[PDB]
Amino acid sequence: RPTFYRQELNKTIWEVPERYQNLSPVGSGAYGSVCAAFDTKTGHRVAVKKLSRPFQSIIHAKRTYRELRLLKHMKHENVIGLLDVFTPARSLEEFNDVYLVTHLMGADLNNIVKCQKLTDDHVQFLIYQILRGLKYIHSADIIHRDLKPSNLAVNEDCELKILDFGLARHTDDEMTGYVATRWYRAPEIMLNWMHYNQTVDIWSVGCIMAELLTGRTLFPGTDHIDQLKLILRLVGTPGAELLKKISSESARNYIQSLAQMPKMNFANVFIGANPLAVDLLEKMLVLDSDKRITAAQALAHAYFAQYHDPDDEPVADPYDQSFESRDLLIDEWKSLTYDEVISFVPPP
Ligand SMILES: Cn1ncc(NC(=O)c2ccccc2)c1C(N)=O
Ligand SMILES: [Cl-]
Ligand SMILES: [Cl-]
Ligand SMILES: [Cl-]
Ligand SMILES: [Cl-]
Ligand SMILES: [Cl-]
Ligand SMILES: [Cl-]
Ligand SMILES: [Cl-]
Ligand SMILES: [Mg+2]
DSSP states (O other): OOOEEEEEETTEEEEEETTEEEEEEEEEOSSEEEEEEEETTTOOEEEEEEESSTTSSHHHHHHHHHHHHHHHHOOOTTBOOOSEEEOSOSSGGGOOOOEEEEEOOOOBTHHHHTTOOOOHHHHHHHHHHHHHHHHHHHHTTOOOOOOOGGGEEEOTTOOEEEOOOOOSOOOTGGGSSSOHHHHTSOHHHHTTSSOOOTHHHHHHHHHHHHHHHHSSOSOOOSSHHHHHHHHHHHHOSOOHHHHHHOOOHHHHHHHTTSOOOOOOOHHHHSTTOOHHHHHHHHHHSOSSGGGSOOHHHHHTSGGGTTTOOTTSOOOOOOOOOGGGGOOOOHHHHHHHHHHHHHTOOOOO
């Protein structure tokens, strides 16, 4: 066990191993508080997150376990990984606080799409890296659920990491009105007409790619229904084949109240874009989720010929999510979390 030291920063007590020095508060959310620090063991600048009320309810205890399991599994160049996890507690009986350590990230994709002139080469490389990370994530049967520019870290060499996995957290209030929190969501989950599945992440990538090409949000709806109307004007209303597949009766009743619309010509929407970029967008932004391109298929698209290497696009180890269907007490989720904290083995 390392030696820990205590300090109060912004009315919050931080008790951390001596290896972490020069702690500086950087932000706070409902999830917890975050400090930047220097890690003397690895030489990395790191982000240290202290979880807020991690075991206050069954829902919150299960969410803490879910986050730690996901972060411990992810080992890929284009996905956030876990450098360390620790607790100052010396036994399960005094266990109360959880701290998570990752590489410190600077700019997100917002900080570049608004502020840079991107060449087509930049778009190729950025979307390539998102799809490389997504192939890995999806190969473990994980769904990200919240891909958007603020959840993509980028550095000065245009290298990208996927962050901030959806932990089943977002509220109804946070999705209401003219809000970027909803602009990247697939139409079939915006009003919960389908269960989440991996194809919803590919919709998000299409929305992001379009915005990198044009500098503008693709579907900036003022509310759920305005946004659906923007989507259907671009990709058309459902055809007979998709209508037959749609399982939600609420979806069918409302959708068939709208006048039918054909799919638009994407070459007249994304004026001046690389024809190969337009072709890939047509394959991602498909209304019928069953027919969207997959991440593995998209990596082999000719738009990425300059970067695609099928020997350097790895898949993930299997990921056991059977805990999601389990009903446990608060203290049982807490004990499972404690076991995962003390069993952590750092990367080389
Ligand atoms: C079997 N199946 N394949 C696709 C799909 N639905 C859709 O892709 C969809 C898209 C927009 C709005 C609502 C539904 C279904 C289904 N269970 O509804
Ligand atoms: Cl230490
Ligand atoms: Cl990382
Ligand atoms: Cl503790
Ligand atoms: Cl965003
Ligand atoms: Cl479904
Ligand atoms: Cl009509
Ligand atoms: Cl597993
Ligand atoms: Mg985020």
